[PDB]
Design a protein around this ligand. Structure first.
Ligand SMILES: *[C@@H]1O[C@H](CO[C@@H]2O[C@@H](C)[C@@H](O)[C@@H](O)[C@@H]2O)[C@@H](O[C@@H]2O[C@H](CO)[C@@H](O[C@@H]3O[C@H](CO[C@H]4O[C@H](CO)[C@@H](O)[C@H](O)[C@@H]4O[C@@H]4O[C@H](CO)[C@@H](O)[C@H](O)[C@H]4NC(C)=O)[C@@H](O)[C@H](O[C@H]4O[C@H](CO)[C@@H](O)[C@H](O)[C@@H]4O)[C@@H]3O)[C@H](O)[C@H]2NC(C)=O)[C@H](O)[C@H]1NC(C)=O
Ligand SMILES: *[C@@H]1O[C@H](CO[C@@H]2O[C@@H](C)[C@@H](O)[C@@H](O)[C@@H]2O)[C@@H](O[C@@H]2O[C@H](CO)[C@@H](O[C@@H]3O[C@H](CO[C@H]4O[C@H](CO)[C@@H](O)[C@H](O)[C@@H]4O)[C@@H](O)[C@H](O[C@H]4O[C@H](CO)[C@@H](O)[C@H](O)[C@@H]4O)[C@@H]3O)[C@H](O)[C@H]2NC(C)=O)[C@H](O)[C@H]1NC(C)=O
Ligand code: HEM
Ligand code: HEM
Ligand SMILES: *[C@@H]1O[C@H](CO)[C@@H](O[C@@H]2O[C@H](CO)[C@@H](O)[C@H](O)[C@H]2NC(C)=O)[C@H](O)[C@H]1NC(C)=O
Ligand SMILES: *[C@@H]1O[C@H](CO)[C@@H](O[C@@H]2O[C@H](CO)[C@@H](O)[C@H](O)[C@H]2NC(C)=O)[C@H](O)[C@H]1NC(C)=O
Ligand SMILES: *[C@@H]1O[C@H](CO)[C@@H](O)[C@H](O)[C@H]1NC(C)=O
Ligand SMILES: *[C@@H]1O[C@H](CO)[C@@H](O)[C@H](O)[C@H]1NC(C)=O
Ligand SMILES: [Ca+2]
Ligand SMILES: [Ca+2]
Lengths: 465, 105, 56, 105, 465, 58
């Protein structure tokens, strides 16, 4: 009963409350925490490890699922058109929404009680966590159906299985491209990108493609990017009434907002035309995730930064200096050395006051503390861990989109034209979108263009006899 | 594993023909370093009151959050060169890569 | 195990006189993979999992 | 682990203070490469009749031994530059490093 | 279900099947018995099966002292405060100590010579009786422990048993380290590999993982190629000691009675010093005493140790030859002609391809021992990489390595540098003439031998208090 | 659990009329660590594990 008990007994590892906490005045309370499931339960021989429930590959498993029963449940099985299932009670101005899931304890229903809109069903179980996330899931579902539709038109004799597989493969490729061409360079910056992701050669069957335990924590660097509001904008990119800026503690699991408050278009506009929060060493993460995470759907507001640090401990991860060493980076021993490495003596003092030694700094806390590489949004530690991970996911993926034999040359030439702005244009009521690179463009109207200037994906080289 | 295929399996099985679970779902994470537990093999640092890590008291996660992470949220710095879509794609991508199960109540 | 709301549409298709054999057979196979071997088993499962099956 | 010690533990526990089972007894081997089993995770190559490894039949270990390892013992070549104590120290040293249990009877 | 007697393949049995035209086993319904190594996580369908090391990885003389606390106490003499290891209470070897006897449920030593009724011995490791030559080394180290404790007690009269035992144990551990890394490993690896994989020691590095790698348990079986088909016994003039100076190895396995009743350890140690090892050659890999008659006196059928090695690598899920070549930075032959080039032997390459189809599939032991040997070494580059990598980790990752600052004083290190295996034999046996250094190369009497009195003893003066 | 042959000599020491008290206390502790709490339990264990303890019965 880790959800309501503060007793520390397996499998609960509750976060205790320090004296003079700014928010939780009751020191006998706690922040709930369930330890990650062990790969070998009950063993006193094995070193405890945790489990990845998903495919490590960048294969759009968050659309299609990572388990056969779920993958079939996500499909429309009433015809041979190769489509993903869509909501049967609600549409978004005539366009598809994700189907609804049937959970035994559904958190989405608790966000707006009268509305009674349950969580959505997707390839991954977290698709409802924030409506912005939902919108991207919804976007990709639509793009699947659009591709299948066009392929059926182009190849009338293809059966549903063929259509589904061919569209799935295209969606997988588009996720890879957006990820490696557009996203990761702006994470790592140019130096790290060249270092950790040199030009692709060919599939290497001796590159291990598993997710590393540490990556599950280090990739949470993203929490530093989070804005405290969800922003919604109309077709003139103006604030969309009645609630254009919703505190994030009122959008977690709030599926009703997608269904009943204007669909995905206002949310996607808001994503394009609002800045990310910058990570700064004195401004690491916002109150809405530090103080109020999921407060509408459970007994207490969680602290996502604190959870990250508890989880690194739960997973038995080494501390900052061990990871610095692993990455071939110098390991500071003193406060002055840590000051030099962080280019910030004041933060180094705070960290040493907490941890006593940089050897003990938790990996997320240490990672996000580092100064950012030029034109990236992580420092050298996180750049090493994240860059190494994604290099293995690419070089160790037999179905990487550029691997010989996965696509024809003509198909690869067509895929090179895809972009996330175009995908938005094709699947929503939006007609004005971010100019490439979508991840950098953030100010309307300066950074925006009409959809009609963007070339569509040409599927002509998918035509069979 | 079949010696010829054309599409990914759903589970990721058979991507690597010599070691066909690698990258497949519901398998242990790979470790890039040996694990560090209070008892060597299972208990997290912070579990037992009074037990230090490498010579020092373990800091309450929440205290580290209070003293290092917290800031006055309305002083937040907008990133001039990133959209919130940059944040969002990251989470979406994360959800392609890893989900770590935990026991149900 | 849980019946999904969108699967209600499949019951309609299975009860449509004018849906073709192949269409119905694909759906029957889909539900047999979940332990549901007749339209009666299918409707009953939907009911237990909280859906309104009164139209049936 | 105690913060000061003077002698090795018997089990090897606490030699590595940060990860104290490393080199200790009754723990899993480390792997330098991912494992290769017929089913991905448990069954050895050679288990299931007809199941190939990486495109080729598995060879009976005894067959390999017969055709490659066997030789007529009268041909044996003494090593001019090594004593039999060279062999013996090897086995004795092996038995300081690793013993892999198997089930009894 | 009993793997010893049945040829049914059911867990935990993985019996070796029999080819047609086997030179020994005519009946293809028979088999060579084989039990799968115990899994670290029994029964799991999530974990990737791994096996267990029951010993300390460290070079710490755990084969003398044991690797578990009950056994370590059982090996000790608890009837006084002299810090001694227990000695056999029924028999001695010309007045010198023998190993104590073990009490096993099905004692295989009893089955060698039934009338003599001499059980297996008790030592730090369970295999101490497997061949009498091994027993003699075990017995020698037991005596050296007692000798050191005796001298230390004389030197430090106030020391209690625990102190004496620990101090002697530490000295014995250091001597196994020195003999191993100074004398033995250079003759395994050759000088080039030795410099590559074991550069001059700096200091303990707590980030070097000291565990035994799975592949090492198989690769270090290269030593099977070194085995002669006889055990050789010589008298104090290094002449054949009558009337069984040359016992076939299939009549010495578990033959503990031979140590106790047929002349103790002196004849056996002389035979090891003054007889050559077998050379591994590509057409003379391993002898029929272990390939045809392994343990034939104590079991239903003679085993094949080379075949067992190959079955075991498969049981442990080890990658084949080319994966290990690649791991080690060595070229990977794809064709029979390339394999021919790598082995300098087209005929062997053809035989290996006839068996395995591809060099990708060659079992690690078979591949490893097939390679031509490095200059002045007794393995080829693949085995040298695996073995050298392993022993570097054991040294650099050992907090109690003999040269690590704070383990021994400078004066103690200076004294230990004078130890050698010939001296240890002089100190603890009736032998007065021994091999000149290097014992592992010296193999021919009288040319390579010297009187014991020319060898300097270990001076313990810097252990005084 | 199995009684070892060399441990028979410890029974002798425990039964030695004027052997040192501290020695016997050492050995009693040793056998207590093995679940043998009396010289009764000690010789009984030796017997079941295959040895002759009839020599002790005078
Ligand atoms: C104490 O001992 C530590 C361990 O040393 C190892 O063992 C001892 C016995 C010796 O044999 C050592 O030579 C041996 O390294 C040392 O820490 C290690 O330092 C190295 C050098 O900084 C670290 O390697 C770096 O690793 C970065 C991370 O990527 C590694 O892990 C990935 C996931 O498994 C893997 O896919 C990568 O290939 C890489 O693996 C390492 O490869 C190198 C190259 O062969 C090996 O030397 C490592 O042992 C490998 N480790 C394993 C087992 O995974 C890489 O990003 C980095 O490379 C990149 O940056 C450098 C920057 O200059 C470029 O040269 C390079 O081209 C590339 O762009 C580099 O390989 C290693 O990870 C550290 N290991 C640990 C456990 O921390 C200590 O330095 C030593 N201390 C002292 C004072 O002696
Ligand atoms: C296909 O990919 C293979 C894996 O590649 C890794 O991941 C990809 C994504 C890239 O980042 C790549 O750079 C990575 O290496 C790749 O095979 C790998 O090739 C390297 C280089 O040949 C091998 O490294 C050598 O390793 C041996 C063995 O020791 C290693 O393991 C132990 C135990 O974990 C560690 O303790 C060691 O530190 C090593 O990590 C070393 O002996 C060897 O070093 C010695 O030799 C070199 C060269 O003379 C000297 O410079 C050193 O000082 C030493 O004297 C190398 O470090 C690596 O093991 C191997 N991995 C695998 C999985 O096989 C392969 O080459 C790629 N093929 C292509 C692209 O065609
Ligand atoms: C609306 C945005 C985001 C959240 C809400 C949110 C929340 C979480 C939670 C609750 C966890 C689990 C906490 C725990 O340890 O109990 C969590 C973990 C992970 N994140 Fe979070 N996250 C939001 C946003 C992001 C962004 C932008 C990320 C990266 C760019 C990101 C990453 C991750 C990852 C990889 C995990 C671990 C997942 C796993 O279980 O393996 N998140 N987040
Ligand atoms: C008289 C000399 C030797 C033997 C008799 C002998 C026998 C074995 C046996 C039966 C095994 C187990 C086989 C199986 O897989 O079931 C075995 C394994 C190991 N060896 Fe052997 N060996 C004799 C001699 C040597 C020498 C000289 C070695 C090294 C130089 C050597 C090594 C090893 C190793 C490391 C193993 C694996 C041990 C483990 O359990 O981890 N042996 N040997
Ligand atoms: C909870 O959901 C209900 C139902 O969607 C919301 O009520 C709607 O509110 C809008 C604007 O306030 C009106 O135009 C609709 O007519 C309302 N419908 C109903 C059924 O009354 C309500 O606003 C939501 N509450 C929150 C959390 O804002
Ligand atoms: C089995 O063990 C017995 C007992 O030692 C051996 O018999 C001894 O053999 C030698 C020479 O044959 C004699 O010196 C002893 O007097 C014999 N003793 C007894 C008690 O008979 C016997 O040789 C061993 N078996 C083999 C085949 O060597
Ligand atoms: C399947 O596709 C048809 C045709 O587009 C559609 O009307 C139906 O609603 C779809 N069913 C589901 C469950 O998505
Ligand atoms: C213990 O030491 C004494 C004195 O050296 C010796 O006589 C006795 O046999 C030893 N006992 C054992 C079991 O080793
Ligand atoms: Ca995936
Ligand atoms: Ca050891």
């Amino acid at each position: 009963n880790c959800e309501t008990s503060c007793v520390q007994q397996p499998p609960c590892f509750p976060l205790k409350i320090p004296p003079n906490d700014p928010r939780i005045k009751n020191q006998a309370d706690c922040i709930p925490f369930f330890r990650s499931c062990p790969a070998c339960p009950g063993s006193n021989i094995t070193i405890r490890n945790q489990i990845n429930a998903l495919t490590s590959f960048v294969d759009a498993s968050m659309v299609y699922g990572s388990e056969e029963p779920l993958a079939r449940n996500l499909r429309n099985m009433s015809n041979q058109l190769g489509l993903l299932a869509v909501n049967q009670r609600f549409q978004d101005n005539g366009r598809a929404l994700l189907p609804f899931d049937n959970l035994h304890d559904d958190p989405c229903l608790l966000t707006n009680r009268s509305a009674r809109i349950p969580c959505f069903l997707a390839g991954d179980t977290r698709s409802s966590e924030m409506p912005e996330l939902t919108s991207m899931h919804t976007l990709l579902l639509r793009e699947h159906n659009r591709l299948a539709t066009e392929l059926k038109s182009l190849n009338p004799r293809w059966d549903g299985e063929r259509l589904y597989q061919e569209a799935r493969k295209i969606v997988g490729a588009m996720v890879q491209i957006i990820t490696y061409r557009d996203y990761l360079p702006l994470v790592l910056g140019p130096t790290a990108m060249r270092k950790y992701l040199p030009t692709y050669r060919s599939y290497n069957d001796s590159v291990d493609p598993r997710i590393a335990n540490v990556f599950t924590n280090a990739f949470r660097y993203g929490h530093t990017l989070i804005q405290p509001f969800m922003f919604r904008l109309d077709n003139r990119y103006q604030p969309m009434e009645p609630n254009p800026r919703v505190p994030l503690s009122r959008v977690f699991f709030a599926s009703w907002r997608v269904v009943l408050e204007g669909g995905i278009d206002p949310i996607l506009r808001g994503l394009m035309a609002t800045p990310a929060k910058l990570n700064r060493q004195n401004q690491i993460a916002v109150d809405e995730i530090r103080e109020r995470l999921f407060e509408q759907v459970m007994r207490i507001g969680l602290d996502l930064p604190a959870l990250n640090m508890q989880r690194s401990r739960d997973h038995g991860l080494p501390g900052y200096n061990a990871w610095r060493r692993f990455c071939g980076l110098p390991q500071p021993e003193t406060v002055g050395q840590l000051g030099t490495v962080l280019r910030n003596l004041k933060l180094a003092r705070k960290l040493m006051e907490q941890y006593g030694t940089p050897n003990n700094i938790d990996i997320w806390m240490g990672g996000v503390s580092e100064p950012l590489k030029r034109k990236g949004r992580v420092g050298p530690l996180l750049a090493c861990i994240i860059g190494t991970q994604f290099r293995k996911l690419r070089d160790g993926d037999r179905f990487w989109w550029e691997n010989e034999g996965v696509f024809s040359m003509q198909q690869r030439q067509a895929l090179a034209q895809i972009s996330l702005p175009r995908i938005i244009c094709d699947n929503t009521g939006i007609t004005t979108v971010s100019k490439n690179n979508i991840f950098m463009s953030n100010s309307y109207p300066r950074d925006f263009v009409n959809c009609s200037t963007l070339p569509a994906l040409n599927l002509a080289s998918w035509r069979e006899a | 594993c079949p010696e010829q295929d054309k599409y990914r399996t759903i589970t990721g099985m058979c991507n690597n023909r010599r070691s066909p679970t690698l990258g497949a779902s519901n398998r242990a994470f790979v470790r890039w370093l040996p694990a560090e537990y209070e008892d060597g093999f299972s208990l997290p640092y912070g579990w037992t009151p009074g037990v230090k890590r490498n010579g020092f008291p373990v800091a309450l996660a929440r205290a580290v959050s209070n003293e290092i992470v917290r800031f006055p949220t309305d002083q937040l710095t907008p990133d001039q060169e990133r959209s919130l879509m940059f944040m969002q794609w990251g989470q979406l991508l994360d959800h392609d890569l890893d989900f770590t199960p935990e026991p149900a109540a | 195990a849980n019946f999904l709301e969108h699967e209600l549409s499949y019951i309609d298709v299975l009860l449509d006189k004018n849906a073709d054999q192949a269409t119905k057979d694909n759906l029957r196979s889909y539900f047999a993979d979940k332990g549901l071997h007749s339209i009666k088993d299918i409707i009953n499962k939907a009911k237990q999992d909280g859906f309104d099956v009164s139209k049936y």
